[model samples]
Target chain A: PKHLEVYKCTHCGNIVEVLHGGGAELVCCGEPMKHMVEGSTDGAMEKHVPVIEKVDGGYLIKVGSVPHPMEEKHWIEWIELLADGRSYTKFLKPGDAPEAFFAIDASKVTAREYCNLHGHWKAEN
Target chain B: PKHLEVYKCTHCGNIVEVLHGGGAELVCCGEPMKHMVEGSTDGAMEKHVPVIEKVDGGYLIKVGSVPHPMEEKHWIEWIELLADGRSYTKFLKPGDAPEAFFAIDASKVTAREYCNLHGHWKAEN
Candidate 1:
């Protein structure tokens, strides 16, 4: 939603998010970047889809209703929030808690996350 | 360098560094992890090789002698320091200054970085 798009380079697994509409083409490793599509049912829905909740003045994004794993072998790489034309992200580590709080106030918010094994998933609120 | 090995999953491009020798195997996306080897001469050496310098009580790790681009399309993803079985890392953003500082006193130290386009690289001090 919000017309925010994400792209990934299959050649090197570099993922980038499109900040705004532009004519410039996305490229990496001498190839055009692939537009990343969200996967919801393809993997564990309870462990991949982002769950959004409203805090006092911001949004809290959890990897899933059930907490996602933050183990060394697999974990949520990053969580992003897109609303209007702005995007905010929180990069995570293996030991980081599987939740991110975005102190942003906006409607039609789209929360997305990348699982190391499950790929990308999103939830719109 | 200092027996610290980095592993990357070729299938998903998830990179994990080995902190120490262990019996457990590294796996991701249903396959064994591929050991990541450093490249000093593969791509633009001046832009990808890490340069190390001593600070007052820490070591400053720069992407290169010639400052690397911190453009949105191409930037250093992270910088890691491994010394005496201890690891320290600093994650970077597109607009961040391309350098990291680690306040550790050790004889053998290894500095590593991952470029969004150029892959993994390192320099030992």
Candidate 2:
């Protein structure tokens, strides 16, 4: 039996599995680059940077927070590849600023994205 | 020549000049005891307590702030003395929570009453 894994976009709410093997470039509001796309547990992900990992059943991806200076209108995008040889991408616009853009299985999108959409927390560190 | 002085209530905006000579008791929103009635600059007034003073032309009165626990619904009352010996008191209800309760010859009611009606400040000390 394989360990069923799930991959999701924290910004756009897109979800995918490792069975789908493909690479995607994710974009979020106008935040500065803060993360790297290398080893699953390698370099420190910068604020607003996205992450990608390979799990037992599929691939897992994570996104980081964006700095205030680059914090543009709320927006996020993602791409995914399925093991069945199919691929797809998703994006969220500024209008969706007050709600969750995406949620995969039980995992959630980036924490920053969640905070921006929900405004439950203050902007201070 | 008679010294023209102005007497005003800092709670209900009531105004009366010494040319008039009468007395009135002012009531304000629910608050604990404060201040005293005596020599104008003699004793120290407590918070939420109202003050009364005598001027060249009339009488001057002042009120203080109330503590937190007793800070109930906003309300204020005031009494006035007129040279003609006529006296009257005014009271403000809680519903009048967003406007000036009184303003005498340019003098305003109690500061706390004003703050409560306007909500421009926080409730913290």
Candidate 3:
């Protein structure tokens, strides 16, 4: 809602989220992308909810209190930070820890992530 | 075990699922993708387990009994089918139905999916 906008393509399940103050028409799979709706979760993994820890420079954003599964098939695809009226996205893969480091002004910002199976998720910083 | 292999990168949260006949390394984000390990779910949605139904041409794979959330923030990235010594993967996005149809030799095969949060799951066919 603040800096990031979510979009989806129904035909092929392709997703695209803009990180900057961009314009309209996020098209994918050959159609206009539907806006992503942010909401709560029901069947999410325990501890998979991201936790914010204050590190030396800025902060350490962990996927969960407990580390998430970093397997090739099921892993956190990316971790996003929306802070200081801006955004940052980190692309992830298997073997990579379910966490990302950010050097942002995190006083009041929102963090979100994408799981290959589970839907959208967010944590405050 | 049959055909698919998963992997990840410690540097980045990159994931790769290999299907069909192959023999080599899966590298991503500047490193070899770690192997994905298939396992059960805990905090998973009630019906997010892939439901395999018999269809006309081949088969229908749905994410859950109740439709899984396909919002921009969180959505099913892909659905994979392993049958008759081959693999088929369907890339998906939010707004797309949480299901995919597979035209394959489905007599004896496995179906799996990736959740952005929950992890990997499989149902037999």
Candidate 4:
């Protein structure tokens, strides 16, 4: 996928986004990490899916139409924007806002977010 | 290196930025890729160095005090900002502006730029 592959370590809960593919296996904690499939369904789409809007200098990415929880137990870990083989990411903590602004104006772009408990979710613009 | 390892394919001129090191050899065109060391002193420092300034919502990164050339033959390929284990990048082309603004504010930040001819140059704030 040109959007890039995301992997997670089940044992230690470590996540990694593949920057480039070289047929190399990603192992963590003595085990092969699991590939996280992006899920836009099977959950509250209004809360898990990402929403993108074209703004002045770039794009504004919001977690969902309805804001997602930002509590310590279940929060969005990060938000990523991919366009034209280039990517920009914003890492988030529990108390951070659920949106990010990237300085790019692309005709086609993808916005992805990771939840602490719900895994991967994405949207396109 | 915590700043991450950059590998370039000598055969195809492909560049891959390593996100996480896992003892995997990055291979391209059936040959081991060469690691590109960041070069901040080999070229004209004032023309290649990145200058960062704190802005309203984030950090503004300019290629140099004198503004690096954005010509077709020798242009900045990309600009990357790293802070607190998070990264954001803006890809550039020949007629594009030689600067980027990232929606981030951090006391310790690193701004890196890659020139087609000069490899890598960086500055910290």
lDDT of 3 by residue, B34-103 (tens): 4555554453654467888988767789987777778887777677666643345566778889998754
Best by DockQ: 4
Q: Please count the clashing residue pairs in each candidate, in the order shown.
A: 0, 36, 35, 0
Positional deviation of A95 in candidate 1, in angstroms? 0.7
DockQ of each: 0.03, 0.00, 0.02, 0.21
Candidate 1 lDDT by residue in tens digits, A1-125 = 11246555566565544322233344445665566688833888998999999987678899898999999989987787766434556677799888987655477898888887777899999
Global lDDT of model 2: 0.25
| Model 4 ranges off by over 4 Å | A1-78, A83-86, A91-109, A113-121, B1-3
Q: Which parts of model 2 are misplaced by more than 4 Å?
A: A1-45, A53-60, A65-74, A79-84, A95-125, B1-125
| Interface quality of candidate 3 as DockQ | 0.02
Q: How would you class the docking of model 4?
A: incorrect
State interface RMSD in Å for all models: 13.5, 37.3, 17.4, 5.9
Off by over 4 Å in 1: A1-3, A20-25, B1-125
lDDT of 2 at A85: 15
Residues B1-125, model 2: lDDT tens digits = 01112222334332221211122221112221112222233322342334434444333433343321123444332222222211112223334322221112222222221222221121111
By TM-score, the candidates rank as 4, 1, 3, 2
Better of 3 and 4 by lDDT: 4
> What lDDT tens digits, residue by residue, belong to model 2 across residues A33-84?
1122222333223433344444443334334433312134443322222222
Write down the lDDT of every candidate, Cα atoms only.
0.69, 0.25, 0.60, 0.75
